Amino acid sequence: MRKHLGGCWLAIVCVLLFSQLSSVKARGIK
């Protein structure tokens, strides 16, 4: 039964979604 939601779960998505955005011009992804 699905483990994804709208909550503290977004804290896993958020950091990925800026890391990837950053890593082209900068370090970003870590």
Contact in structure between 23 and 29 (CB atoms under 8 Å): yes
What is the distance between the alpha carbons of residues 8 and 24, in angstroms, rounded to a whole number? 27
Could you give the count of Cα atoms lying within 13 Å of 15 in the half-sphere of its Cβ?
A: 6
| φ/ψ bin of 2: left (φ > 0), alpha (ψ from -120 to 50), beta (otherwise) | beta
Angle, CA 4 vertex, CA 19 and CA 1 arms, to 5°: 150
What is the distance between the alpha carbons of residues 17 and 1, in angstroms, rounded to a whole number? 25
Helix (H) or strand (E) holding 10: helix 10-22
Residue with tokens 């890391």: 19
Let me know if 16 is exposed, middle or buried by CB neighbors in 10 A (0-12, 13-18, 19+).
exposed
Experimental technique: NMR
Residue with tokens 């890593």: 23
Angle, CA 6 vertex, CA 11 and CA 3 arms, to 5°: 90
